[PDB]
Amino acid sequence: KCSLTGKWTNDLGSNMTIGAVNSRGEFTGTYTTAESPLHGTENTINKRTQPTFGFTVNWKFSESTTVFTGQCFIDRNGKEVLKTMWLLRSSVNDIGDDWKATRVGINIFTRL
Amino acid sequence: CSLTGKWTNDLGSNMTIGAVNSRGEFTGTYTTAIKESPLHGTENTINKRTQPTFGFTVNWKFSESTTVFTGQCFIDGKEVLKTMWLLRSSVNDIGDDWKATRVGINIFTRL
Amino acid sequence: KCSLTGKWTNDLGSNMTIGAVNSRGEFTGTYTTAESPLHGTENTINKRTQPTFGFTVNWKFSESTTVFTGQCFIDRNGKEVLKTMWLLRSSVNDIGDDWKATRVGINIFTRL
Amino acid sequence: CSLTGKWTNDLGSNMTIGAVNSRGEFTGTYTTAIKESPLHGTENTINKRTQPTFGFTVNWKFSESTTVFTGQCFIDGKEVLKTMWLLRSSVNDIGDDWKATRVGINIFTRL
Numbered sequence A, C: 001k002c003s004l005t006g007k008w009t010n011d012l013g014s015n016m017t018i019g020a021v022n023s024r025g026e027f028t029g030t031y032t033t034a035e036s037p038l039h040g041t042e043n044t045i046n047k048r049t050q051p052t053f054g055f056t057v058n059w060k061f062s063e064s065t066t067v068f069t070g071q072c073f074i075d076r077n078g079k080e081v082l083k084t085m086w087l088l089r090s091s092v093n094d095i096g097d098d099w100k101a102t103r104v105g106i107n108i109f110t111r112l
Numbered sequence B, D: 001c002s003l004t005g006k007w008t009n010d011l012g013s014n015m016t017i018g019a020v021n022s023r024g025e026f027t028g029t030y031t032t033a034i035k036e037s038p039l040h041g042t043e044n045t046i047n048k049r050t051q052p053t054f055g056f057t058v059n060w061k062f063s064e065s066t067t068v069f070t071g072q073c074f075i076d077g078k079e080v081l082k083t084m085w086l087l088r089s090s091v092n093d094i095g096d097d098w099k100a101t102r103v104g105i106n107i108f109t110r111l
């Protein structure tokens, strides 16, 4: 089974720690990048080995917000890997600059 | 512009969001024809901004999928929520991962 | 049948003109926003009434690039409408700032 | 960093791009296991940049779908192409449009 709980690191150099996840599939943690809290959920439905999930990172050094979503996989080499895609929403003043507030990208995590 | 309350959108889905603590957290329900799913998000409180940026995850109850929403609460007069989302599907093997993510838009208005 | 050929306008105020599309599904045109050329393709496969397509806009006022993709629909009210999503790639100097060069958005077009 | 040549990627697809005129246009073939599809793109020539931004459309031959790619040619030493794409599926009714677009990444390297 692929568990979210733990310490992860990615291709960009950022690290992430996730706490235990309750029965409601909920969980919290911290996102570290060269610290901000994050709160997410894991899909419990058919209680699968490779869960789908999503979390929000409330940036504490700016008024932007990032949301990641992806799946917890057991790689071919037998290792746990998190494939995720995110949307980074920056804040704009007029509802007219809104068309450019959203960036999109990816991030692959592996256990620390 | 506060997230608390009742919203609906262009597709025709309703969303209910409760109070948000001093840390910006909040919970709510997501309704779409119908099935209700829990929602857990957070709003950026960095600058006590009147048009706060925010994000939340909808944990689907009728599927093994997940959907994340990010956006900003704009005072159009009326309060409008402009969002963009990512819909992650669950695939059996890491080989198909590439085709598992849909992206799209959604404008919410006070129900 | 929903044709790409013609003059369109969108929700953002930008206008667009598309030329005839050959048998290879190819076509060119111009994108006007408050002028840059664009070159695209339309999917011919099962020669459908509501084609799928994609085009690139070679910005002539900056070194960024935008690509749109979507489908040509016959709306319920009987009108032609183009639902599209785009990616706007801005250019960065170091392959390390790459994680933030891509923005994503939407654009709905209707005939002028 | 020029697009002309032969590239392959992480998924394992090959792409061949021909010469690009003075306007930045170019054509090529897209191979994926196998089926070959034509590609038509353009590269930004605004600043005679050595690491040009670019975009192109792949007109699928075995489906009614379309895929657009945008990105930048980076000199990693080696020439690398970092791209992001949108895969549009064709739906019968404008009602399902919302679920018709997939997004993803792709890193190309000189084959």
Ligand SMILES: O=C(O)CCCCC[C@@H]1SC[C@@H]2NC(=O)N[C@@H]21
Pocket: A012, A014, A033, A059, A062, A064, A066, A086, A088, A105, A107, C099, C100
């Ligand atoms: O500089 C900005 O544009 C705003 C700061 C955004 C915070 C870092 C972002 S979140 C998505 C991405 N993944 C990651 O690990 N770092 C970046």
Ligand SMILES: O=C(O)CCCCC[C@@H]1SC[C@@H]2NC(=O)N[C@@H]21
Pocket: B011, B013, B032, B060, B063, B065, B067, B085, B087, B104, B106, D098, D099
């Ligand atoms: O039917 C499926 O494709 C799987 C269930 C998907 C859940 C509904 C999606 S989430 C993004 C989109 N916005 C919205 O309000 N409803 C749809």
Ligand SMILES: O=C(O)CCCCC[C@@H]1SC[C@@H]2NC(=O)N[C@@H]21
Pocket: A099, A100, C012, C014, C033, C059, C062, C064, C066, C086, C088, C105, C107
């Ligand atoms: O200011 C920038 O960030 C670079 C200029 C980008 C050009 C305008 C973009 S293309 C996608 C979007 N659709 C539209 O009609 N106008 C915008």
Ligand SMILES: O=C(O)CCCCC[C@@H]1SC[C@@H]2NC(=O)N[C@@H]21
Pocket: B098, B099, D011, D013, D032, D060, D063, D065, D067, D085, D087, D104, D106
């Ligand atoms: O099988 C399908 O889902 C429809 C055909 C899709 C065409 C292949 C897609 S395009 C984006 C992605 N990158 C890549 O190199 N191959 C895939």
Ligand SMILES: *[C@H]1O[C@H](CO)[C@@H](O)[C@H](O)[C@H]1NC(C)=O
Pocket: A009, A013, A014, A015, A032, A033, A034, A112
């Ligand atoms: C995070 O991962 C470990 C924890 O110390 C370490 O290898 C690395 O320096 C850390 N990097 C960041 C950006 O926190």
Ligand SMILES: *[C@H]1O[C@H](CO)[C@@H](O)[C@H](O)[C@H]1NC(C)=O
Pocket: B008, B012, B013, B014, B031, B032, B033, B034, B111
């Ligand atoms: C929810 O929104 C309103 C509630 O006032 C209702 O009329 C509508 O039918 C509902 N839609 C869904 C999908 O539940």
Ligand SMILES: *[C@H]1O[C@H](CO)[C@@H](O)[C@H](O)[C@H]1NC(C)=O
Pocket: C009, C013, C014, C015, C032, C033, C034, C112
């Ligand atoms: C484009 O559409 C028509 C053409 O004149 C007109 O209504 C409008 O002013 C034009 N706007 C732009 C930005 O070109």
Ligand SMILES: *[C@H]1O[C@H](CO)[C@@H](O)[C@H](O)[C@H]1NC(C)=O
Pocket: D008, D012, D013, D014, D031, D032, D033, D034, D111
């Ligand atoms: C294309 O790339 C190389 C060509 O040298 C070949 O070995 C590989 O099998 C080919 N892959 C596909 C999908 O055609």
